Amino acid sequence: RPQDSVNVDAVISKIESTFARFPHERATMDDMGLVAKACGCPLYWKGPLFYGAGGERTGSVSVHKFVAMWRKILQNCHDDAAKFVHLLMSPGCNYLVQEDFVPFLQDVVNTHPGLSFLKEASEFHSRYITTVIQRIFYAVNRSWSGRITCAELRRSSFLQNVALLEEEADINQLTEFFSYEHFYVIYCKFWELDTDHDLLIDADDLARHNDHALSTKMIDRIFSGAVTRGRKVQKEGKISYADFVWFLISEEDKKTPTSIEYWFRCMDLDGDGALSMFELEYFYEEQCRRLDSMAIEALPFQDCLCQMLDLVKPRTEGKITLQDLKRCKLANVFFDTFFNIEKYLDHE
Ligand SMILES: [Ca+2]
Ligand SMILES: [Ca+2]
């Protein structure tokens, strides 16, 4: 059998032929896989399609409601990225926020063969879901706006991964977003720190994570609001599991575009988009003191600065920009120099 036509009338006709198979021409969630195929969508769009047509409100979706919606989508959305954003977005918002992904991911948990074991343990559903969503925004939401647009989604590999869910029974093969194994490792590291089990960790806890390799001034910036995704205004002195995920991923690889932005935001004390000499010295100050505790005589700030200027080659004298750090391709060295002491554990 040859491929289906792509045009509007043909697609609508195919949808109608599919709904004609349903009692009362209303689709339940169990029918939505067939509906996804009629739409030329990957299987795991079934949840988004159902919720998109308000299925959660009445328990089913009539052909008339679904067709009217899909007509609109085909009029407004030329590609998969546009269609996906349209399905998940809140009315009034031309973008996706973290919470928009929850029903989709819950359906993935409820139905994907690779998560069957997890499905019967709803205790950890939300934490798995939270983890996947963090990894999605970490990779996709390059503007740090908290709002994923069609353009951002289009530039990512996210939808490719969604399409692959139906092809891979072992979800752990899909390492970028959905991997349960990646979630497990991340969660267990959080668990080690959260010793009183209140699902929050403080600065003392966070310092333990890599054996006090990060300076206390940098640890304090993690708690400042500079990188929090939770939009909280007050300095609460504790961070959530969700924010820990962002820290862990950033700390383990300081070379990725998102991670460079993460550490840049922390160093950018006044949040003006440039690292001033005051800001660099503020951090390097503590590095020297820590190095002293290890019988290492640190370079004076101006000597260290010579080497960093040569490493980074910033465009404008007197400041280091995010663009400078990305272009030098050695931002991890820059960051480590200013706030990371790998073998600080061995200090005497
Ligand atoms: Ca705790
Ligand atoms: Ca600044």
Residue numbers in the entry: 134 to 481
Paper text:
However, we find that the structure can be more accurately described as a tandem of two calcineurin B-like domains, which we have named CBLD1 and CBLD2, connected by a 12-residue linker (residues 301–312). Calcineurin B-like domains contain four EF-hands, which are arranged into two so called EF-lobes, i.e. pairs of tightly interacting EF-hands. In agreement with previous observations, only two of the EF hands of PR70 are loaded with calcium. These EF hands correspond to EF5 and EF7 in the present structure, but have in the previous literature been referred to as EF1 and EF2 respectively. On the other hand, EF5 is distinctly non-canonical: it lacks the two conserved glycine residues, and position twelve is occupied by an aspartate. However, in EF5, the aspartate does not interact directly with the Ca2+ ion, but forms a single indirect interaction mediated by a water molecule instead. As a result of this unusual arrangement, the chelated Ca2+ ion is coordinated by only six atoms in an octahedral pattern, with two of them being water molecules.
Protein phosphatase 2A (PP2A) is a major Ser/Thr protein phosphatase that together with Protein phosphatase 1 accounts for more than 90% of all dephosphorylation events in any given tissue or eukaryotic cell. Each holoenzyme consists of a common core formed by the scaffolding (A) and the catalytic (C) subunit (two isoforms each) and associates with a variable regulatory B-subunit into a heterotrimeric complex.
